[PDB]
């Protein structure tokens, strides 16, 4: 037994959590009341009560009650025990300083007490999965505060992130670049591996592949949940690759700071479409090397790979996979760094992707998620850093953070750390 605790912070984190847990229940045959009329690996994510009910090993946190109030009134209100749904009264008002200091300091001890109660039910706790936005005050500020405290209380215990990188099409605050840089600086030394999800990449996939004119968070989250499920399937089912949280780090992270893999998923097919030919292993593998299927907008052809993991799911045969990888190498450069072998770590998980009934995604016989650590991801940091610099040169909005007890020096420190991170991606790709 190797349990994983999921922490959902702020609106983005909570809403993505709702999509993930809905999907896990469909995959494991768990009803919204926690009942299942039944491999056994699902126990890493769900504990069991005396009444035979299955409860997510998760904590939902928000500084405002609105979002979580929807979970406690919704379809899955019986799935979670009330104590694992934590809300404050006053939000962080899109201010990292409010989330981290002012408001966060009041609820931190309560959140850690709930996490401790979940950890006490674990015989072999692997670690934590933290879901949050970069842009919101709770998602940014509270997450970095929580990450710091988790390192103290859970000495050398694995912590992985699912971070929502901001997009202007769906952005709610002008200050999102500030919050993003402040949270990245503070969390960097506390996270083992972080999977960024660029809201624009997801918005564009929904528009292009799912024919949704104006994608909503519901559309975005369903797609996000599919990628999260692909990453976590080998923890929740008896898988062969990324079998434990330590294996994510081992396979994808060559240096402590360069811990940001790029996720690419395929196929993304519309449900409200005429019956079509099922995609082959070659077709879905080819789709992994297309920038249009990426979870973060960036150009891998302008970067270098340091690790590549291919996670197949469903009706997939090793012979089909190897043939597909061989053809790719003949047509594409697929450039790796000098100190790394040009290769792939491949995993096949026998369960085909499950989709939400009445959802936008079509049911497929086979899917694949590629997790690659490429230097091209630095392009996402550069875009964020430039927006930060534009405002910071004029000290625009800085007073909001200073007023909450933050020092201007923390902004300089956070930005210098980001400059060092960009420099690290550049230095790593050199030869």
């Amino acid at each position: 037994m190797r349990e994983c605790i999921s922490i959902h912070v702020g609106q983005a984190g909570v809403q993505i959590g709702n999509a993930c847990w809905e999907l896990y229940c469909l995959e494991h045959g768990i009803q919204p009341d926690g009942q299942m009329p039944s491999d056994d690996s699902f126990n890493t994510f769900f504990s069991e009560t005396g009444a035979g009910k299955h409860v997510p090993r998760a904590v939902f946190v928000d500084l405002e009650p609105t979002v979580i109030d929807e979970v406690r009134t919704g379809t899955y209100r019986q799935l979670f025990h009330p104590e694992q749904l934590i809300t404050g009264k006053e939000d962080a008002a899109n201010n990292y300083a409010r989330g981290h200091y002012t408001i966060g300091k009041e609820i931190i001890d309560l959140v850690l007490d709930r996490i401790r109660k979940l950890a006490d039910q674990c015989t072999g706790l692997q670690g934590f999965l933290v879901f949050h936005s970069f842009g919101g005050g709770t998602g940014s500020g509270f997450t970095s505060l929580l990450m710091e405290r988790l390192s103290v209380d859970y000495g050398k215990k694995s912590k992985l992130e699912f971070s929502i990188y901001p997009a202007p099409q769906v952005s709610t605050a002008v200050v999102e670049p500030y919050n993003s840089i402040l949270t990245t600086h503070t969390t960097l030394e506390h996270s083992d591996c972080a999977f960024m999800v660029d809201n624009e990449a997801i918005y564009d996939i929904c528009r292009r592949n799912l024919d949704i004119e104006r994608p909503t968070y519901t559309n975005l989250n369903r797609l996000i949940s599919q990628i999260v499920s692909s990453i976590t399937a080998s923890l929740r089912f008896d898988g062969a690759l990324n079998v434990d949280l330590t294996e994510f780090q081992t396979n994808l992270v060559p240096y402590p700071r360069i811990h940001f893999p790029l996720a690419t998923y395929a196929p993304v097919i519309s449900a409200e479409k005429a019956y079509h030919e099922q995609l082959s292993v070659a077709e879905i593998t080819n789709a992994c090397f297309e920038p249009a299927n990426q979870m973060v907008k960036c150009d891998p052809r302008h970067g270098k790979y340091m690790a590549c993991c291919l996670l197949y799911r469903g009706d997939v045969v090793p012979k089909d996979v190897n043939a597909a990888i061989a053809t790719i190498k003949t047509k594409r450069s697929i450039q790796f760094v000098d100190w790394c072998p040009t290769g792939f770590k491949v995993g096949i998980n026998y369960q085909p992707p499950t989709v939400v009934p009445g959802g936008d995604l079509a049911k497929v016989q086979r899917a694949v998620c590629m997790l690659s650590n490429t230097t091209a991801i630095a392009e996402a940091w550069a875009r964020l850093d430039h927006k930060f610099d534009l405002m910071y040169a004029k000290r625009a909005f800085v007073h909001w953070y200073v007023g909450e007890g933050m020092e201007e020096g923390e902004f300089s420190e956070a930005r210098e750390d980001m400059a060092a991170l960009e420099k690290d991606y550049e230095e790593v790709g050199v030869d």
Partner: protein
């Protein structure tokens, strides 16, 4: 963040405030008895932001009505929705302010202030999570202006961490009831620069010009001007009182709108422009609604937005329309009019769409702009002030109340610094 405590001060403040309450009650489906008779769950979702729920099905405005003169209060009670207000929330003096800021701020106002704070404390302590305060007042008078700013300072003292918001009506010679309005306005602007978090600059110069020039009303009345005020107030508060993602509370609005502490004076805009009688009207598409953002003709502050640059903009679209069309039209306007938006504040235009249109219209648009062009409004007040102050005209009305000349010099200088500050950011470049 939930409850907003509303305060109405002076003749103008109470007139505009009463209209705000009848407009929003109609939108939320609340009748003059406090009973909800609407047919949409959206109307009640965020009802608690402005209304307290009393025993049973009744909703009561979280509003405090203030004046140094009793007459205005009687007129409010007699009104259409006059019965909806909490009886204990009417706080009035007997000795007016006589259109003298000094009487409102130091003499008569100071005598009544504690009775008002007692009522605001009652409303505030009832709150689960008080966002802050919303004050409606004029700057040209004595009560709204002098006592209103005194209240802001006294409230700021007791609730220093809450958001202070105002709807401040600027005086104009075009619709003037007193020769001393430039003095009262300047003294008040000095107070607002220091004590509020956000101020909606509602200009009577602009309202008169809209009524006369656009609505073709030969002789505009306060009723005609107030119809534009209430349409604007309904529009700018849409995000606070209906479920939404953007600017859902007073603090998130301030965080998105205020880059520098003193630059918190907003230029409101509204489309389509309508007259009280005009229940016609057959018009207004998405490209049409969007075009009126740069239209000086649609501004509630007498400034040309094309004479400055937008630091930040919030745009609220109301009615049944395409969100895709709104997003396209809004992006087009920013790309075409690049030069009127500061380059050093990326993605500084935020848009929200609310399905519920205001009364009488099927489609509407409200604009909230933090523009450097607002300096034109402050310059106008400073020049009117100086014409009088140079000759120390009517100064005896103020010094007679115990005021010193220095306060006048200080208020004027602070307002001119504000103008200079807007000019500084207008000229700033992303040379970075």
């Amino acid at each position: 963040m939930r409850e907003i405590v509303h305060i109405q001060a002076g003749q103008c403040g109470n007139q505009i405030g009463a209209k705000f309450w009848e407009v929003i009650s109609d939108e939320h489906g609340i009748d003059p008895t406090g009973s909800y008779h609407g047919d949409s769950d959206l109307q009640l979702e965020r009802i608690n932001v402005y209304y307290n729920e009393a025993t049973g099905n009744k909703y009561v405005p979280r509003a405090i009505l203030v004046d140094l003169e009793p007459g205005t209060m009687d007129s409010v009670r007699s009104g259409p929705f006059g019965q909806i207000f909490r009886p204990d929330n009417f706080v009035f003096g007997q000795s007016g302010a006589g259109n003298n800021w000094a009487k409102g701020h130091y003499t008569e106002g100071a005598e009544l202030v504690d009775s008002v704070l007692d009522v605001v404390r009652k409303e505030s302590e009832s709150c689960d999570c008080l966002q802050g305060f919303q004050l409606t007042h004029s700057l040209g008078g004595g009560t709204g202006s002098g006592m209103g700013t005194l209240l802001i300072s006294k409230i700021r003292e007791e609730y220093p961490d809450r958001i202070m918001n105002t709807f401040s009506v600027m005086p104009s010679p075009k619709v003037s009831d007193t020769v001393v309005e430039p003095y009262n306005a300047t003294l008040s602007v000095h107070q607002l620069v220091e004590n509020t978090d956000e101020t909606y600059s509602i200009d009577n110069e602009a309202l008169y010009d809209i009524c006369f020039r656009t609505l073709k009303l030969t002789t505009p009345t306060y009723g005609d001007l107030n119809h534009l005020v209430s349409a604007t107030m309904s529009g700018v508060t849409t995000c606070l009182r209906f479920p939404g993602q953007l600017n859902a509370d007073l603090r998130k609005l301030a965080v998105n709108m205020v880059p520098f502490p003193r630059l918190h004076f907003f230029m409101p805009g509204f489309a389509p422009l309508t007259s009280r009688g005009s229940q016609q009207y057959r018009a207004l598409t998405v490209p049409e609604l969007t075009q009126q953002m740069f239209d000086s003709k649609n501004m509630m502050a007498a400034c040309d937005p094309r004479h400055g640059r937008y630091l930040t903009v919030a745009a609220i679209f109301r009615g049944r329309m395409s969100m895709k069309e709104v997003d396209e039209q809004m992006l087009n306007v920013q790309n075409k009019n690049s030069s009127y938006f500061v380059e050093w504040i990326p993605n500084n235009v935020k848009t929200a769409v609310c399905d519920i249109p205001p009364r009488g219209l099927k489609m509407s648009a409200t604009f909230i702009g933090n523009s450097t062009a607002i300096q034109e409004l402050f310059k106008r007040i400073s020049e009117q002030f100086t014409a009088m102050f140079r000759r120390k005209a009517f100064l005896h009305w103020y010094t007679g109340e115990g005021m010193d000349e220095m306060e006048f010099t200080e208020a004027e200088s602070n307002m001119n610094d504000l103008v200079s500050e807007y000019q500084q950011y207008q000229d700033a470049t992303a040379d970075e």
